[model samples]
Target chain A: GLDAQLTLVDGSTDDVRVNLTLTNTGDKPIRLLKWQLPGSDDAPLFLVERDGQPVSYEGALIKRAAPTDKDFQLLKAGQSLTVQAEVSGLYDMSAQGQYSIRYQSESNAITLWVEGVNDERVGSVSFSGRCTNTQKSDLLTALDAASGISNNASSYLAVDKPDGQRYRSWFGAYSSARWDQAETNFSKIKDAIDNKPLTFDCSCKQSYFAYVYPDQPYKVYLCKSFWTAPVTGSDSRAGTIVHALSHFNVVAGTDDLGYGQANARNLAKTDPVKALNNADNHEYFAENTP
Target chain B: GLDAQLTLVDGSTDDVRVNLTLTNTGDKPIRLLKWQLPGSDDAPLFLVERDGQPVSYEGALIKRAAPTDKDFQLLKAGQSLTVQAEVSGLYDMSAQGQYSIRYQLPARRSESNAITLWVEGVNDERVGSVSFSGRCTNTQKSDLLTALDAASGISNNASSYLAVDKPDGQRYRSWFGAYSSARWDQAETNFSKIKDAIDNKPLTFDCSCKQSYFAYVYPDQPYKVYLCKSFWTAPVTGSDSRAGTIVHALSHFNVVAGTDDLGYGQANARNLAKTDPVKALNNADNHEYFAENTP
Candidate 1:
């Protein structure tokens, strides 16, 4: 096992320097590989916290691509090495707060007290969800039509989910012929909605199926599993897409058309398209629209 | 005079290409000097708009360095030249919408024409995703937006001081110079500090050659903006520098002051001051000025 501690040397206004000392506390010498450099290359894991919650950081840490050459440093027993680089160079420390940094590969961590300046770490809320921009834009387009709001589409939230394999894999289950028809069907439904001039005012946070706490109101979250698999004849996931979005719109002030579970199921049986269009109904449809 | 028109060639969902035709409309032969190439190096003047408003784009057209060997293209009377390049490669068109483009030259300007296309555009949204848990003052939010716009090569509050003739849209190129300069590293650092400053207080600047005031102390100093009196002179304090000169001067100061030894000599600094009087007066006011404004 190894230990790490960061020593603050010169805390200049903009160019503060910190010396990181990594010690091999074990009986055997340790080999450190795949470690990031302090300044020029990728930096260490750095976070700023206030009141026990992680604050949103607008500044970026310069992340460099891994070099082609492999490098390792050897630390013999009872020996330590110190590498010093600018703290500001590693992070955007312009936000005044308590900043803690740790090596990604090691357990050792340290904290630095940043003085008052512009607290860029203030007033930003983060959201995590499963929808891609286009998918969300599609949902917004549909909502705009239902709500009679402007349909001026610009972009999805900046928050994004990295794992889109579910979406890809779900499409994978479909035969090429099946996939093409599904794509065309979805496109037609999307264009059928009203087009007007309005903007979708929400930022994207992640790509997951569900959303919860810290997930602000009026924000839409897409469930990946809901569309992860293909539907057979008379079974439609397209209806489910509109159905799921209706839940978000309901909170945004639309009436829950089906009102409850029993009513929603009965509504789907009578009219599949209308059921899918109902906010109270489940996202999936067992029957095709006649 | 010369006239330019853009014609669409291929309209793939992701990649699109266009051909530009330049014709000599004047009686005399017109010379083409500062033109942009589409992909590899800088290409010609390009804009992409949607719904009658300009849409911000992320991708870049390759802009070539000015030719030290100034050989002008001769468009003889009643003759035309056609050059083709990928429009997608020119401006980022990942967003789905109707996009229109036009070309700018000494001779002619074209009307906006829409090209129907769909692109799986990059994931940058026009508005910000996160808001601080605490309220950011209007000034702070404005500054943060300015910093974001600058980084994305979108226009910002900063004016066109240094290179007015070149493309005004490319902030990264103008700030760092050549897009290949080490100044990019420095600019990133400066941007972080500005982002921080915008959230904390008003970014303050000094116009008189004397002491520059800043919110953070030295070293972690976020915005040490300083502008000298001479910079206000004719042609110097023009439209461009009025917004940018302070920021530029601050960046130069951040790099030089970090080191005790700057590569420039005292004599060299003095000589540069003679030629560049604004920088010279800035140096004479204080040693910090010399460290921050040295050529």
Candidate 2:
């Protein structure tokens, strides 16, 4: 692949700009259409993800004729091209945490750390977290472990987890900018289950381990796998409870990012913003003890 | 460096004796204090671990006079010596998970590559027999040990690939989760950390060769991997070589590197490497291919 690197050229809470350096780190000349490249006319040139959420392009979408010979730019072997773009107008940057900005026309990304997202108002009410007595034996171990998450979780969930894990090593951004609220999310989950008091279930139904719905009774559905899986580790009974607890509409409405441990991690790396609402990611983090 | 390889002589429940062959593959002779060499008189020649934990050495410590000319064994260039030791009595190999055994010269930093075997259960003779149905013939057993020696060295040296070895391609980096951009310093500053999953995942054996495939691994990371017939009979240089096969099997284990089976062979692997580097790097075929073709 051709060499491309993104670096911050300027940064302010509300205004941000970056440089997209295209270097011919190879021996052959390269050519490509100048899409939203710098100086190629402002047409939403960057894909900006702020605090794990995609900041929609605020710039006008360009509708033009197909590219011609004059539209392509060439970089001779050993040549370099540097372009600057003030991305604030292209992407919405009203709120901030960490911004991962990618050049729409290239294979590179740069992280801009911005720390000014004001606390937004949010809240409230009735829901029950439960586990059957038989399953409680296995469920409790994972639940307690989840309530007291660890440094190990931080390590695995880190934005740049150095590969080689047994599962979803690809889920790259757990702790990167905009999405580093894993601890805070866990705390919210803890509040929901602990404050209302954890309940017990007698009916272990469906193939669906334990679960909860928003409009339903908001009751935790303690299923067979919830209490029957080998107590801890990745998909154990422990993580199962966290998944269910995170599910009860009482929390942040953590939905299915994807199914299974691998899928959750896989989706997070591919789409961290969407992953923030994934129940499995929360479950995996809690049950991920060796 | 000297070439030291360890092998199982025969095992049954607890009757686990092994052969440690020290070949002076070096250009010059090297000498060391003969602390636990076979004829050097049984002073605990091995460190054995079962089910990921170290098994205690139960043998008595033997004391002797200070080192002298007689105490040193010089392995001349191009020469080799094979010694034998029944590891059961020396180290407590009583538990039943997979056993990982390594031999080292008593006080020196000299050692051999590790070899693992699963002890099914305690036998009447207390012999640590590694069950192989009827296929653990002396020949296949030799090949099994031989394949392990190669597997041990390959995984052991994989982390040794330098991030600077660019012509070597940055293939090795992503297997350890380090992208092509991640340096050795960034990936696993402590090389041992990179080797933990690759080296620590142990294997027992299944000589039965019962499957159509030459070798197969369970997705759950079980100890006994089914090493079929074709695996034992292949030449060592090809991708189908036993050594590469072992590496491929280990990658299936979630506790191991957790690489998936993204097809097989060099071309398929190279294609994947270019198309989806992340998926390619996290694949078993790509991992074994990279390690086998290392320059």
Candidate 3:
């Protein structure tokens, strides 16, 4: 494996060049060859603005050479090759904003962000995204409610054994002794799904069940506990699963139920169980349908 | 993690009983609960014949009980649960063959070793004769094409050019086709907008990397031939282009399988370019033609 290190030599706007060093950290001497950039078959460098937008640049297209001994370069054991590329020449950094230059050599990639006069940059973008923790009690309550709905729906329309099995497995694995006061914050929606018919008037209809962060937008937060269940069935818990997932869609502004929040709520009016069933069916079909 | 094993006790043709055991290999007390079986929710088990063909079974549907503390059984640390199930009643085993049962529990799954049972009692089904080839339909091919169309960067007639080989023992073709089709179609679509040299052309193969040269163009030919098998054979992770070689080739010219590079030094890099066009496009001069066309 090649250990690539990218160092920003200049702090000011004029001399913006990245010092990229490729080191053969391994015991044996590794062969050095040119590799493709991420998006295009162009140069090994790409520049992006502070907001994670790619900085438009003009550079010579990466050329493909015939396979020959002279074409390839080899780095000796514990040897390092340091190359400097002017960032401003590669891309137009005239716009007043912090910019990050990406240097990708093969699979090993490094990014160095430099701030212009009007730009502000704290550090390089962290690979690890922020993750928020969901309250165990809140999740368990949702699971418990889902279990009740599944039981009721199963009684009406006998689902498979694995459905129950998966639900049980998910609950047992996630449940903890340390309970939190954190709430799922869908009380009105829960009441409507469980006891009474749901309505468009409910305030919780707009609230999202999925997690979202300030840094990243337009993406659903994936819960760590969601993967614990090992069951497979489209028609498992009927409306319960749909009712749960709809909150995420509602937040992300793409409700799977065609009619939006009103659809699930309206269905609960006629047959509460059927509402749950239809939501689950629609969500499953949306994902698995060819 | 739990170590579960399924063993056959009575190998007789009359009674095919299986001993199922669950051992908690981890330190903490593991939960023993209902797990999803491979087939439908109704049946708790599935029997497959020697050739990986599922045996027909008519059994009571597996019932779902209420979830409670009582339903959740705990397999304490260093503890084991040994139970037996007579599978003869679950499925009719009158036919002479070696059979295996798949048992899934929670996140863990275990399959019983093949147990030979006979109508007359002999080694009827040989161990090596079983074939596990998958079946693919035209609908699946169409589905694959549609997915490719959505993902591809270029808008071209790929559906007409593409053909999915029927699933036999060549599982890699199916794997390669599915993976390469999506990635290549996208890369080609991306390349198509930049240049007109690479046109919407038919690429055909039985899956070969050494069958023809990459971007192999015959005299006055509109289309090129590509051996897409490299999609599955190439390296995926690390510095090496595992399965990405074929993908890179398809991104540029119509690729064919010709010579394979396995030599040391520069030859390895050349081989990588021949295999992974994406890397070649970045490192070599031949692929820069597309990037040169871009503004």
Candidate 4:
């Protein structure tokens, strides 16, 4: 029921204020809780700056201060409460860093870290699977094995967790996702592979994570086939992660991306309409997408 | 050095006894601080018995004596000591169980648990590299993207301190000597494909004390190979563990029968080279002897 928004600093002025909005989407009346800002533990609560001076938040921002701050105020269903407070702080964009926002109400304490730099609110992917360094020539090749070629130059993806669940899980899920909605069951891609049992190895964990995205190796790259594939009951989390990992043109202990595609195409059978179709579609997307 | 031959109690007599020889291998003289057999705190020292009887030290088994009266004597360099005491009841090897040998000596108190089971001690090929789970479906892979992989699996591989000259040394030591050779390094596996750039990307504290080996994925009907052709090196403790994970595999002197031969062939490779080679050669020799007797 916490549909609240807080603004840490006003970009237009030096004044620092926090805005709280409590929108109750549920049927019950929601009670108000305390709010806090980051700094030293003993920092005081302030609101509204006047003549370069700070004013204490003794009074409510929207209404007059009430006695007995302990009593709970009820907001009926579909009702919302909006409150704002002003404080002082130095806002230096050049000195970019992360700050935490905390809101404590009742027993729940929700805190979110805000970065000086802007970030998008898009949905993120997490990975799962086991990671161990492989016998690549060096560390870079091992990471290459973990990452796939679907992600090549220009997209500049970043590796995250070393033993990152995201790195492995993403590869698994993303790979399956791409294959599931394939037009030719990735057959064309598979047929191109000449060998069986390809080996990929890595010494570095981060590079491995970035190598499996379906986009440019380092940037955003989403294939329409994967984006528009029909959702399936068997749409497991593993396949989706692999589908994502395949984008980065990575393989464990090996760097032969083209050989892999051909091998898959050859191994992929035309029977089992569902499996074949999945592989076909994946191959199509892999070739077409970044 | 501990060298002793255990007496075989093949139902000959009820009691089993042997002179346990103890020699000092370390530099300094090792003193015996205190000794205790399996007994109650105040109970008399229970002699290790066989067939429900105690073994003797001077021809006749001694019992009803104060075994824990005082600390044992010190052992000097190259000197040996032998004591005849009844074995613990739990030391019976016929049944499945475990026993711990505890010794309190000068400046050291050590205890070791020896499990009685079938454990083959040989060169293990499945040493490094992580294993992916088999239960995962065609989808779903691992989550660890581009974190660091350590031979010892110690993330936060480096250390920091107050000293100026030695400011922040690498604290890659292991706990309790379990993983003595552990150090953190940049992501250097399939994970490198997604390796996060430390210069511009965010980093976290990560370490892996153990390496994965013989762990791979079943891609198609066959399996996929991870780092399988790596070699090993000597003095592997101080340097980057990940790099030292690669080996030379050819440094065993005074080759034992089980010692693996070093060469280009996979059979002769350092990995499992000693054990398999020696076992096979012994088997051939045994076969030749069997032919002369059976045929």
Candidate 5:
């Protein structure tokens, strides 16, 4: 028999850290799988809840070969082992409230109160349920690269930089001020991709590059063009993934103010006020690395 | 210049036939691309509507080589060409209502005034939310009614062929055999069961993309037909029609007839029917080709 104890170490969205201890209860030693126990990626090992509502496991599901003898970790009788894990990095703990974290089949759960914190974790993405696109692996590669670009965009948006005011070309003036807003919308774009989980599905109706409903934030339906676009370029697949994040209302909630780079440039002059709230403007800005 | 005319020949869901004519109105002869014209197997050449609102085209969109001199049809001055087409077989005339059709050079690109038609009777009705699953377009949606039309035609044709005693014909002999009246009765009842499974019993149509299947029904979930992209794009008037796939899926449902996928193709179905009549009746392919092959 084995006894497990979980203690909340930190409750930030960036890191919902927990200190876990496992002790051998019976006289005989028990050899356990290490991944579920400790010192490995904690892939949905704990059932998490926020304010008594069960939160979904947004962790990476690993596909691997059958476990070998080397994977087995032994616990001597009356011996205990402790390990620390950042659970929220794997699970969705973006909700700002009280959370109850319990290990699998464990009778008791540890409680923690977390205040609002911007998530820095690379948001989860699922290719599980039937992605018929031929370039599945390639699509994933672009997504990984896009996450890096988006994370940097958030960094640029976070600080009040005098150099960040380089070009107010695309983003319009606010209250007679250039590209200066109280809250950087691009930071919310970072939050959506880093906090919320995303999914790739094959339900495409039109000839658009990618498809996402305003209400359905995390679902990025990859169309023909999404899979067919070049891996690297000015109009790259990586840029498209970042563009898709802006369409989510849960992100910056920017609508399509026309399409492509030309339109973004046009809107920057013609309708500069609306251009600040455009999906294409946010996308082209990051693509050009400004 | 070119003049076009469209007339409703028949308005039955079983056959929404139309007669169309194209004439040279100018002094000089006009050369037109035969694509979407008389000889093309697929492609919509008409602006169609059911009642007042527009209905979508449910025909095949064939991808072909670029047009050459060989691909064009020539019409001399004062000459006319006429062709009759089963419009419902290729369009969304699914809703039982009035329809208006017009012949154009694709659009008001040239034309005739809209010809009207009234479609009678409804074939397939869903048990509310249990019918369709996901983003089923007008093409895929009307495909259900077109399939039902083919199925209904197959059912009625079978009944008519077998209504008399000692029916000696091509289709009956091909499907069953030139044999016992009792076997004929069994095949008839079996087809009715296939029809009932689709029409009477509540069956859901799940729309999916390239699921690597024409269409499939899970052995456990008898009433759901998981249709892939190929099901919507199959030939309209052949053994592999959307209707045939529907019947094939229905045959697998135990509540319908509980048939197994013994084998495929018309030859295989015919061979099995000759040797083992009982097993042939229980075969999915046998039921499909039978209903499709039935007069």
Candidate 6:
């Protein structure tokens, strides 16, 4: 474990850069390499030298795959590389208790650790302490792949989540699980399609509800939460869930009911009589649909 | 800070939602209002009673700011308000500790008070370890005038500190500072004319090296690390300087270049000339500059 001091050297504002140095007191030319800040499984710990040039963590993993013998470089026999990585994590931990940072040298894939540091104490972003479920799954992997493609024609894709929506706002980005719910709801609606295809809105209505389903032409929106963490890592799922649920019923082409009163319109589109007295189908859809 | 417990009754993933209730055991109804989670902002705490819908931070901030004499009936002396809010931040804070719930009670004059709870950590949707600046200010104000906006925009605008160069299959956001030395090296060509005007062009074209100035715009960003205390309360003058530097620079684009460059580009904005480009441009335009943006 490298014993280091976290110092707030320059005082100008909220941005504080703490210089962390990992000195190898070992006699051999030990190349301190591949390791993580522990607890953070999916995140990569960038390794920087004292001079500030970045040490690449390309294809590095935090667990399941420890660095092999070839991973470590030769730190001339008596030499040491004081790796300094500028990590911008939470300015503090939950109670400011003991936290550990795990690191390792490449040569033998040896492990180096740093334990016991007082992290600052502060509230999590949301004041109520309650969080929405935003942990992304393989879905996040899909997003990573999507983000790599720059050319639309060649890739014809984007991160599973849109960059705009992903970083849109802290709240939107993190709590966009409703995006998946919307997808599910839309899928259900598609599966529930009985017979007549809803009439297409030829007016080019700007609303998303009237999607032009061109022979199963797909429309996918990459969703994101406010947190910078990947889709699988945000904390806001409730917002997305509720939002998607809002779109659960009725086809886009169902006759337009004035003032969102689609019940009469739906009845008119399906049945001639009783159209005027028809109530909104959404209420019925929610109450009786299996 | 009152210690509370947040249990994941049916937690399977971080995205899982469950019904929760907070009991008021203290002498008074610890007005459990709403606030942001630890890590990233933009998320809000919410309160939803059985008949009432969840009220987010924006809603709560509004409600908390209700005429000082009035308090939204969140919870009666012993009654708890049914509530729900979207989690806004991204941090594995729950693994290390509990979620600190901040609230504004009418009794506290809309001031902030926190309740720390030992949350039953769930394997799925596990919150991250979060540490933000301890102080909260300007909870509900016109965003345009708020320090967070001013600070973030100013710092980022001045330095373009947010632009990360994608090299060899690597791209990241926020964690890396705006403007990198290598990227700024390109800007150093026309160092002086940056603030005047910029020609828009694709990647590395006539405008690749467009004269541009960068700054750390997020006021709280700079203060987030230094103004350890209440950043809003930090002094604006000499001894208590936290946000003033960027604020001053943003107000008047007087930036002190922190580094030197190798060469300047021709007015034609193409090839690198023999002279120290940054120096020549500044000399030709009578402006002094230094520093290259780095990740």
Best prediction by TM-score? 5
DockQ of each: 0.01, 0.01, 0.02, 0.01, 0.02, 0.01
Give the proportion of true interface contacts each model preserves, from 0 to 1.
Answer: 0.00, 0.00, 0.01, 0.00, 0.00, 0.00
Minimal lDDT window, size 10, model 1 chain B: B57-66
Once superposed on the true structure, which residue ranges of model 5 sit more than 4 Å away at CA?
A1-134, A150-171, A175-233, A244-257, A272-279, A285-290, B1-242, B249-265, B272-284, B290-295
lDDT of each residue in A1-290, candidate 1, tens digit only: 67776666753343456677878889999876534435433223444344245543222211111222455577899898888755443344445566665544353556666663332212221122212223333443334333221111101111222342321222223234433433333332233332212122222232223221111233333344323423321122333333333333222121233333455556545654444344333222212222
Proportion of native contacts present in model 2: 0.00
Q: Estimate each model's TM-score.
A: 0.29, 0.28, 0.26, 0.16, 0.37, 0.24
Clashes of each: 51, 13, 26, 163, 0, 94
lDDT of 6 by residue, A90-178 (tens): 21211222223323332211112222122221110111111111212222232222222211211211133544331222112222453
The count of residue-pair clashes in candidate 5 stands at 0
Interface RMSD of each: 20.7, 28.2, 19.5, 38.9, 15.4, 20.0
Candidate 3: give its CA RMSD in angstroms: 25.2
Residue B139, model 6: lDDT of 22
Candidate 1's displacement at residue B277, Å, is 65
Span of 10 residues, lowest total lDDT, candidate 3 chain A: A124-133
* Quality of candidate 5 docking, DockQ: 0.02
Q: How high is the lDDT of residue A174 in model 2?
A: 40
Q: How accurate locally is residue A8 in candidate 5, as Cα lDDT from 0 to 100?
A: 76
Local accuracy of candidate 2 as per-residue lDDT tens digits, B68-94:
577678878889888776665455564
- Angstrom error of the Cα, residue A215, model 4: value is 22
lDDT at A210, model 4? 18
Question: Can you rank all candidates by lDDT, best first?
Answer: 5, 2, 1, 3, 6, 4
lDDT per residue, candidate 4, B1-295, as tens digits?
A: 4233223223232222223345666667655533332221111122323333332111101111112324445667777665543332122222122322222112222222221222121122221232222111111111112112322122112111111222122211110111111111211111121211212222221111122221111111111112221111112232212222211110111111111111222222222223442332222111111111111
